[PDB]
Design a protein around this ligand. Structure first.
Ligand SMILES: O=S(=O)(NCC#Cc1ccc(S(=O)(=O)NCCC(F)(F)F)cc1)c1ccccc1
Ligand SMILES: O=S(=O)(NCC#Cc1ccc(S(=O)(=O)NCCC(F)(F)F)cc1)c1ccccc1
Lengths: 191, 191
């Protein structure tokens, strides 16, 4: 409630400036509570970012679970597009949290461990699906599935986040999805 | 001379700890000069990292120029392997400078601009070679060459550096080259 108000205030301020330029007072003021009352709900501004990232990451994760149980009925190219799109839409809707979350990996053990855990989970799932495609005779046994999954997942992380941040260089946001699907599909189904 | 001694001292200390844990006195002591004498050669420890990164980046760049003028006489798979390998060997030999250089992108305008400039140059060259391969009828016109180049280059950056840092997750250093060549070759020559 006042917890939601701190989270919403943090997301809003992270649209105009970095975490280093937001005080606890900036978050308290924003949620319409005192500094001490803020500290009842969170030990630090760093813990606020950690909670926002955790919510975004879990939304993407739950969305990928929903997709896995209920596969789209279409060509394998569009199936994978649907999969990459969970990440494009979810993080695309939380650019400020995403950008700051990734910055905070350099400086926060918990942010690095949180991201690391979900990346291992998304790679393990990518690799399971690639091996399935190999078992049903649809993809050739080229690279170790788990190595291929790791590199594709690291590509998406870097490429999605460069696009969202408008970095130079980057693929424009409106071309990035098709860019990643081409490389996933060719690298998974070619020899 | 005493300039080289500061650079060598910085590279050495960046093997055991981050830049934030190295003082100017740590670099002066190391090069066997006073603090004031250090400041004659460099305005800050941050400028030392910038000079090391600039040297590594220019070595990779000059090595890729040498390759471009003197192409290996082999299959296209091995040609590209030779190309990715400039980056694998060059940065692979300067892991500590590479790791710290990438950290310093978040916190230094000059490090971000230096890296940004060379990435645009390496993407422009990748894209020129892809278009050549399209013109000589060897690769299909799939994705815009420059978008494909950008994503592949961002993949290599993230994947090479995760491997070098031993991050979880990452491809092991001894499997990363073959991993990237498979994805480059399939994504450049498949449809
Ligand atoms: O698509 S499916 O429905 N299920 C397969 C899948 C998947 C998947 C996994 C990871 C990423 S990822 O690398 O983009 N996310 C890592 C986090 C970040 F975004 F990079 F930051 C993209 C897609 C399908 C089922 C069966 C057959 C084909 C596809
Ligand atoms: O290989 S060639 O000799 N010349 C083509 C090339 C190339 C090239 C460009 C960039 C990268 S990159 O993306 O790895 N570097 C970006 C920086 C970092 F490492 F990622 F950090 C790897 C390889 C050839 C000629 C003609 C026909 C085929 C190949």
């Amino acid at each position: 409630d006042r917890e939601l108000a701190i989270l919403a205030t943090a997301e809003n301020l992270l649209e105009d400036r970095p975490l280093a330029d937001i005080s606890v007072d900036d978050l308290a003021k924003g949620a319409g509570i005192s500094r001490p009352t803020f500290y009842f709900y969170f030990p630090s501004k760093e813990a606020v970012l950690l909670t926002l990232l955790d919510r975004v990451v879990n939304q993407a994760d739950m969305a990928l679970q929903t997709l896995a149980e209920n596969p789209a009925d279409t060509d394998r190219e569009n199936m994978w597009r649907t999969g990459i799109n969970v990440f494009f839409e979810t993080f695309g809707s939380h650019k400020a949290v995403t950008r700051a979350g990734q910055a905070a990996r350099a400086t926060s053990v918990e942010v690095a461990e949180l991201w690391s855990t979900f990346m291992q989970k998304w790679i393990a799932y990518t690799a399971a699906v690639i091996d399935a495609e190999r078992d049903r005779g649809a993809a050739p046994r080229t690279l170790p599935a788990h190595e291929l999954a790791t590199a594709l997942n690291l590509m998406n992380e870097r490429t999605l986040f460069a696009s969202f941040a408008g970095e130079q260089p980057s693929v424009p946001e409106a071309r990035v999805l098709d860019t990643l699907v081409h490389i996933w599909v060719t690298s998974i189904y070619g020899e």
